[PDB]
Design a protein around this ligand. Structure first.
Ligand SMILES: *[C@H](C)[C@H]1/C(=C/c2[nH]c(/C=C3N=C(/C=C4\NC(=O)C(CC)=C4C)C(C)=C\3CCC(=O)O)c(CCC(=O)O)c2C)NC(=O)[C@@H]1C
Ligand SMILES: *[C@H](C)[C@H]1/C(=C/c2[nH]c(/C=C3N=C(/C=C4\NC(=O)C(CC)=C4C)C(C)=C\3CCC(=O)O)c(CCC(=O)O)c2C)NC(=O)[C@@H]1C
Ligand SMILES: CCC1=C(C)/C(=C/C2=NC(=C\c3[nH]c(/C=C4\NC(=O)[C@H](C)[C@H]4CC)c(C)c3CCC(=O)O)/C(CCC(=O)O)=C2C)NC1=O
Ligand SMILES: CCC1=C(C)/C(=C/C2=NC(=C\c3[nH]c(/C=C4\NC(=O)[C@H](C)[C@H]4CC)c(C)c3CCC(=O)O)/C(CCC(=O)O)=C2C)NC1=O
Ligand SMILES: CCC1=C(C)/C(=C/C2=NC(=C\c3[nH]c(/C=C4\NC(=O)[C@H](C)[C@H]4CC)c(C)c3CCC(=O)O)/C(CCC(=O)O)=C2C)NC1=O
Ligand SMILES: CCC1=C(C)/C(=C/C2=NC(=C\c3[nH]c(/C=C4\NC(=O)[C@H](C)[C@H]4CC)c(C)c3CCC(=O)O)/C(CCC(=O)O)=C2C)NC1=O
Ligand SMILES: CCC1=C(C)/C(=C/C2=NC(=C\c3[nH]c(/C=C4\NC(=O)[C@H](C)[C@H]4CC)c(C)c3CCC(=O)O)/C(CCC(=O)O)=C2C)NC1=O
Ligand SMILES: CCC1=C(C)/C(=C/C2=NC(=C\c3[nH]c(/C=C4\NC(=O)[C@H](C)[C@H]4CC)c(C)c3CCC(=O)O)/C(CCC(=O)O)=C2C)NC1=O
Lengths: 65, 246, 160, 169, 40, 159, 48, 160, 160, 159, 160, 160
């Protein structure tokens, strides 16, 4: 059970740390019980969540994931 | 500006950072040329296992390279799927006690050593209730990871030139950033951090390696060299040890 | 390591093939594996009851849980339960492997360093592991309780 | 890290007893000292950045070898590090001023100080010397804006001294 | 070093001139490993 | 509450922001009322443990029942000693002004302790509620509000 | 302070120098120097 | 070390002369030395009565002096009296010096190691030092009992 | 400690008088002391022959006495004979006391520390103690060889 | 060699250090000799493949033998086509000045390809050694050194 | 560090300008850099052949690759090849820098600790580095083989 | 150990007789022993002058001998002279033995433990040993100064 998420997290603190200023827009797969804290961490930075999509998993199935 | 309780906030001046050994910082970018992906993959191997597992032993997961080269899973996902793996467990989770496993997984993922006593208390509770995959998930997802490596930057060491350093863990972090770090086997961080609040120990004043065993023959000391177990505490000159008196 | 892996290693470092004494050792292990598995199952049944009975036997209503003792604070009581669950779980692993090397590799490596750093009392820990051993030897029977008590006494002897 | 009110709580918690009259006496002491402590910390906070510069100036007035060849504040690369250490000592002294203890200085400053300073070749004598240029200046600034009794401003710099101290008696 | 250990007063007064020396004190860790084991 | 602002501004590299200095000055002003509330809860402890045991054993009789944990004089004495401990930690939190030195000693690992002791946690929460009711009867309105603050924190923590 | 930890020496660079930096880039990827990482120092030692 | 010697050391490691704050510290010590000496005299008067009253307050008629407790054997009772006399005597020395460094150097150095090696209960020791502190604060007065209780609580806090 | 002293201690720490179970234990010890003394005499007869036969059974003509092995140097062969004589002598003391506490106090205290410090092979030591046990159980008879093998297996189990 | 320095300074946040600019200027100076060496190896390709097949099939006759892979005219034509490919990649590496555009096309996955084709890799290494010998006979001393450079890289890579 | 950077540092810590002796040192380095670069190129040519010839000279067909030796397991043979490649590569870096400080900073820092922890034989490593030095001094010539052997003997002397 | 004793040991642990490479090593040692003995004699001549010149080069007129530094107290200055005399004397022993094992066995064993316990600065010690090495390489000549600097740099590298 994996999700395909596109998201965008600006740190808002690169100007006082002088970091690499790398890209903040990604399309990644995340597993089932992991997307929970990923959701939460992306919302911690005020990040926009563009689109959540099912990669792996049939919904409504109970045994066998 | 660290986002926590017990960690302190520091500032390194901008002059000091420029005059230091700069390190290559391998971002993924999933479109560049054929070698420039393998360089990033070799860097992930060189930093996560402290020596490159291929070209040296030639055994690695060839399943996950075929997804990182494409762009199915990002680097923050790849480090996570590489740590909770059967390959990493045979070298770093199986030899060491859990309190040493925590510090080595701090070096492999966060690229630093434990900053406070509260840090190792919380992360020991997490590895305790959930094995190694819970520790890997709680480490890769953090604020200190995502502010530093984002989604794509391969993790990298941060000594005394890259970022500002604190005094309190300076000694143990100096020995953690080494090739000879996964041989101590004795947790250098929880022992020092909880010896800070407590008074002195009963060890010999000239280091802990001076205390012989007492089994009728002696001539036996913990070598400084065989397995480190280094714990020097500052004794004064008017001390007196406490003795049991048979 | 296993008992199987230890026998294979001891035959390997000589370059020796599997002679009849090693086959005797492996066949004795394959005989004892029945009660090994049954003992591991019933210890995995009620580990929390074993730890509860052990602290009620040894550590409770002492000065250790009183203020001034090392188990006074409630996070320290939770850490005590965690350490006893660790001792029981790794003793179960060493019982099913039939070789105490995992106790030496994963538990007894830097443990006296930690317990002398934190000021943890060692003798009360030894008595708690002793109460663990008595409770699980009562619970599993004498015949598997001997092998459980061997590795629990191994932890107790290495701790001291 | 323990406050002046939480250190009493630890001292009374290890005995397992309740609050008595004496702990209430020291809490009354801390609670009528707090209004003056906050004003002293605001006065030190206001002019802190110039305090660091004048502390550097008098520190180089004292020992010439600090800005000479065989010294540690030679280039600006090695000068900015000494000035930010002045910044650090003043910052944690203000932390210990509002807390009212020396446990902040113990737990966050002094605990790994010998290891870094012996590791980097950094001297210790000129460091405590600079700490006390800082506290003379800070005493002047606290005496400027109101507050008459300045001994609580006086104590945390001296505690930092006594632990950075290479004790020879 | 040997001459200064036996020249001292804490040898001559406790042991005496005609007693074979013998162990009188142990370290705290040295009694931790001795007494607290599986058979106390 | 000073350690809270100090580690709060200490995670950052900034100093203590002067709004935090304002909250420290206001806590310093209210410390005298805090000390009077703590002394009033201090000297009247055995009344509060008596009325808490009263209201609890009237509310939940299963601890009295022999299947429950607090059966017999020794177990009921340990029960009232636990309520005494929680009243003591509430007085600590009343003085400190913020719930850190009471959560550090009574909250942070209490669920697994009471689980491996056999006692239910809801009965302990009802006991602290009875302590809050008895202290609300003992104090004035502005004192009972400020005591029921930290009592409310303990009741929310044990659940 | 009561206890301590294990210090060592720390040698940070006082300035970036060319012919330590180009040795350093081969160290951070643990390879021998490439077919032009040599060719810089080839001209550098002559232009010295 | 002293308070005088600590002030001299703190002025010495900077290379600083004796400034006015150090002279304030020394003059405060020279003011408080009167009651310091009087308190040390009356504590040296009846130390045995203080230790007797402290064990009668805290340790007696418990399970500690019953069989199974750590003070059951009569050599262990004598060792208990010896340890309490040590705590009171070194607290007297630290009170008259005005600096707790001799407690750190001579008492609190390897004491938790010894008390966890022998199986000595730590919380009962802390309560006994507390009863010592209450008895001597009653005996000497409040004004010197504060300074006596500071070093006795220092021993109690370092022991825990 | 003895079996007598262990029975007296177990009756003492409760404050219990000598009940009938303790008298049963002491009378069983006083019954078994006959063969205990006779076994100790005939083991003290020919200890050197037992150690010689044990190294000829287990350690000789292996790679251990070849170069590269731990018994190659002649001082290391003499140290091996010394260690085996120690194991046999302290097993004789534990057999005559009827209590293995002297093995825990005098032999098994810091022995794994020493044998892992020097690089002494542990499994070859265990097999040598096993050969010692077989030789002395043949020499003394089965009835006292059981009690000799109990303490020799105690040394072997604590060593591992 | 410019991509090497660019990604080398690009992993860092720093610019291109001027020692790297010196090595780029020196490569820019030597580019004319590089182009002449590449054209000399270009126009004489079939001689080099002929002499390489000569020296290889004299050295290892098992590819000629019917158990080997290069048995028959079709398989031996595929063999000389492989040698032609490697000569072409060597000319690419001679122009580029650094072995990246030749390793990217001929080295990076060659062992598993030749393993799942059945051919031995040591015979391919001997074929590139024969190409190096024939080009050493074809060129001058300073040209054969600089060609045997990249030929040497291929021979070390195939092993 | 470099030889250039060492000369600049030695002139810097005095506050001295670049006097004529330092200019002599830098001009000697700028004279020797030719053969330094040529030697580094031909050592980077065939490092695998050098390591292969060195293990065929020193370590192969001994007891070290036999069972019981430290190079018996195939992962240990691969680790041996890795360590020898490290010694040759860092000796190449120290040869081109003209200053052995990178050997002290990156190789010789905690290496005896590791080799005594793992039980790696030190004398066989020293003889392997010696065989490396002989092979590369034959391969590069005598004139650059001297400077290569200086840093390889530096690694060998610091290892012992 | 010696170089002779190391060669004999390396030939012994294989069971190997003295082959021609070992005879080459011993004959090289017997060639170099001339200048070894002459260097040891002239270093034993004026060791106090070497230590005096080394502290005048490196440690004097710094902040280390100022108050606050580690060499301020006169017993600490005497301890500094003692440590430098130790480094020079044991480097003389290792030079005449031709094997650095006595430095590892007698000096470098627990020295970082001691220097981090006492708060001794390590970098100033390394620079003092460097000044010792420069002074004795000037005093003895370059040809024996190389071998003296090898063992002094061994002490400096193990100290760091
Ligand atoms: C003014 C017209 C002239 C001048 C004056 C000047 N400089 C200082 C103070 C300092 N100068 C330094 C210098 C450097 N640090 C470096 O890293 C380098 C690169 C080689 C240099 C030149 C430093 C560290 C200081 C502060 C310590 C000191 O006093 O030396 C002063 C004193 C300022 C004050 O009172 O604070 C003055 C008057 N320098 C010039 O550029 C002009 C020629
Ligand atoms: C200035 C008064 C003195 C001086 C200072 C100096 N310090 C450094 C380098 C560092 N100092 C620290 C200090 C701290 N880190 C902490 O976390 C705390 C507690 C909050 C303190 C006090 C650290 C970590 C460093 C390393 C650099 C870094 O921050 O990463 C230097 C630079 C040394 C060098 O040569 O690079 C200097 C010069 N030196 C003096 O002479 C004064 C006595
Ligand atoms: C488990 C299911 C699964 C598959 C199949 C998978 C395929 C896959 N094939 C790839 C490339 C490729 N795939 C092919 C395969 C082919 N092209 C052809 O001409 C043939 C028709 C076909 C082979 C039969 C080739 C030639 C490439 C190389 C493209 C390149 O990397 O430049 C890539 C790009 C990155 C990489 O290989 O490492 C992925 C991810 N990943 C998966 O997780
Ligand atoms: C798998 C082997 C293993 C063990 C045993 C282990 C123990 C361990 N026990 C700890 C603390 C502790 N350990 C104890 C345990 C005890 N104190 C007592 O009084 C009793 C005698 C004893 C319980 C039976 C206590 C009370 C603490 C709390 C100290 C503190 O955190 O403040 C800590 C400090 C950090 C933390 O708990 O999360 C570690 C690492 N780690 C390991 O990896
Ligand atoms: C200050 C922090 C602190 C806490 C929280 C604490 C709890 C605590 N409660 C205990 C027992 C107990 N606690 C209770 C509790 C209750 N009676 C009930 O029915 C209710 C559920 C609840 C109270 C109204 C009971 C019945 C026992 C005895 C259980 C037993 O003996 O197994 C014990 C073991 C005996 C002891 O040593 O006192 C501890 C350590 N100790 C502490 O030091
Ligand atoms: C009373 C309990 C007791 C024991 C056992 C004891 C053992 C002991 N064995 C030692 C050495 C040794 N021990 C052994 C023994 C063995 N190595 C092997 O290969 C065999 C498996 C095994 C013999 C059966 C050897 C070979 C040495 C020599 C190491 C050396 O000195 O170089 C040493 C080092 C110093 C010395 O012998 O004089 C001690 C202290 N001390 C004690 O107080
Ligand atoms: C430019 C990068 C590149 C390489 C390296 C490459 C190799 C390559 N070699 C092949 C066959 C072959 N390669 C050889 C090779 C040899 N003859 C021998 O005996 C020696 C071992 C060796 C050469 C001297 C042979 C005999 C075949 C035919 C094997 C077959 O038909 O199964 C084939 C399959 C047939 C084809 O499509 O040409 C490929 C793709 N192709 C490429 O595009
Ligand atoms: C850059 C400097 C540097 C060195 C040298 C280094 C060495 C090093 N060698 C190791 C193991 C090893 N090292 C050796 C090497 C040897 N044993 C012998 O018998 C021979 C005498 C010698 C080879 C010439 C062997 C056999 C192992 C395997 C031990 C094992 O992993 O089980 C290990 C343990 C983990 C691992 O290899 O991946 C390290 C860290 N690390 C470094 O950072």
């Amino acid at each position: 059970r994996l999700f395909k998420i596109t998201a965008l997290v600006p740190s808002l603190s690169r100007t006082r740390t002088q970091r690499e200023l790398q890209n903040t827009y990604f399309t990644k797969l995340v597993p089932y019980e992991n997307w929970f804290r990923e959701q939460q961490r992306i919302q911690k930075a005020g990040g926009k969540i563009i689109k959540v999509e099912l990669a792996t998993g049939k919904q409504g199935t109970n045994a066998g994931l | 500006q660290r986002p926590s309780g017990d960690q302190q906030g520091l500032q390194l001046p901008q002059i000091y950072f420029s005059a230091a050994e700069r390190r290559p910082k391998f971002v993924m970018k999933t479109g560049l040329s054929a070698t420039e992906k393998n360089e990033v993959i070799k860097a992930a191997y060189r930093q996560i296992f402290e020596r490159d597992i291929t070209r040296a032993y030639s055994l690695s997961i060839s399943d996950l390279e075929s997804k990182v080269k494409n762009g199915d899973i990002s680097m923050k996902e790849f480090v996570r799927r590489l740590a909770k793996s059967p390959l990493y467990q045979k070298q770093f989770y199986q030899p060491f006690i859990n309190s040493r496993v925590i510090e080595l997984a701090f070096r492999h993922i966060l690229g630093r050593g434990p900053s406070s006593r509260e840090e190792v208390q919380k992360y020991f509770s997490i590895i305790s209730n959930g094995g190694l995959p819970a520790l890997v998930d709680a480490l890769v997802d953090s604020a200190e990871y995502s502010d530093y490596f984002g989604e794509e930057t391969v993790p990298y060491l941060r000594g005394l030139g890259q970022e500002a350093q604190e005094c309190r863990n300076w000694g143990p972090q100096q020995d953690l950033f080494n090739y000879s770090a996964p041989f101590r086997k004795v947790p250098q961080f929880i022992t020092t951090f909880a010896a800070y609040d407590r008074p002195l120990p009963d060890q010999h004043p000239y280091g802990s390696g001076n205390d012989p065993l007492e089994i009728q023959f002696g001539a036996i000391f913990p070598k400084e060299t065989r397995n480190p177990s280094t714990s020097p505490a500052p004794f004064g000159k008017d001390t007196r040890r406490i003795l049991i008196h048979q | 390591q296993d008992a199987i892996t230890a026998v294979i290693n001891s035959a390997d470092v000589q370059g020796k093939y599997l002679d009849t004494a090693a086959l005797e050792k492996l066949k004795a292990y394959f005989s004892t594996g029945e009660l090994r598995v049954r003992a591991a199952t019933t210890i995995s049944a009620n580990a929390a009851a074993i730890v509860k009975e052990a602290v009620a036997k040894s550590l409770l209503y002492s000065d250790i849980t009183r203020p001034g003792g090392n188990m006074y604070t409630t996070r320290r009581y939770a850490a005590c339960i965690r350490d006893l669950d660790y001792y029981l779980r790794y003793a179960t692993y060493a019982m099913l492997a039939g070789d105490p090397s995992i106790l030496d590799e994963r538990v007894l490596n830097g443990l006296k360093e930690t317990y002398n750093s934190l000021g943890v009392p060692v003798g009360a820990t030894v008595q708690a592991i002793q109460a663990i051993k008595e409770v699980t030897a009562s619970l599993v029977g004498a015949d598997a309780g001997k092998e459980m008590g061997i590795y629990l006494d191994y932890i107790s002897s290495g701790l001291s | 890290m323990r406050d002046a009110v939480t250190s009493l709580i630890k001292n009374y918690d290890v005995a397992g007893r309740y609050f008595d009259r004496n702990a209430i006496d020291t809490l009354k002491d801390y609670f009528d000292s707090g209004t003056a402590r906050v004003q002293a910390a605001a006065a030190i906070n206001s002019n802190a950045a110039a305090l660091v510069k004048q502390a550097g100036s008098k520190l180089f007035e004292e020992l010439p070898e600090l800005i000479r060849p065989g010294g540690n504040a030679y280039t600006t690369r090695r000068l900015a590090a000494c000035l930010r250490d002045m910044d650090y000592y003043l910052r944690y002294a203000t932390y210990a001023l509002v807390a009212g203890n020396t446990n902040v200085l113990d737990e966050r400053v002094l605990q790994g100080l010998r290891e870094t300073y012996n590791s980097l070749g950094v001297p210790i004598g000129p460091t405590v010397r600079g700490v006390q240029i800082l506290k003379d200046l800070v005493k002047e600034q606290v005496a400027g804006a109101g507050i008459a009794n300045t001994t609580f401003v006086e104590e945390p710099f001296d505690h930092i001294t006594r632990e950075l101290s290479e004790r020879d008696v | 070093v040997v001459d200064a250990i036996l020249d001292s007063l804490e040898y001559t007064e406790t042991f005496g001139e005609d007693t074979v020396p013998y162990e009188r004190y142990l370290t705290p860790a040295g009694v931790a490993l001795r007494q607290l084991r599986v058979g106390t | 509450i000073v350690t809270k602002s100090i580690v709060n501004a200490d995670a950052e590299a900034r100093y203590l922001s002067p709004g935090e200095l304002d909250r420290i000055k206001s806590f310093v002003a209210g410390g005298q009322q805090r000390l009077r509330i703590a002394q009033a809860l201090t000297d009247n402890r055995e009344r509060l443990v008596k009325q808490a045991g009263d209201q609890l054993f009237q509310k939940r009789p299963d601890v009295v029942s022999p299947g429950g944990n607090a059966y017999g004089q020794e177990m009921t004495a340990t029960c009232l000693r636990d309520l005494d401990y929680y009243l003591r930690l509430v007085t600590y939190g009343i003085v400190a002004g913020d719930v850190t030195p009471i959560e550090e000693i009574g909250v942070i690992g209490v669920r697994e302790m009471y689980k491996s002791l056999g006692t239910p946690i809801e009965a302990v929460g009802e006991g602290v509620r009875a302590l809050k009711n008895a202290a609300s009867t003992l104090l004035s309105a502005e004192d009972a509000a400020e005591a029921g603050s930290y009592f409310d924190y303990v009741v929310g923590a044990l659940q | 302070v009561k206890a301590s930890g294990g210090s060592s020496v720390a040698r940070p660079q006082l300035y970036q120098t060319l012919a330590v930096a180009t040795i350093t880039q081969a160290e951070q990827q643990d390879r021998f120097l490439g077919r032009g990482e040599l060719d810089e120092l080839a001209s550098y030692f002559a232009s010295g």
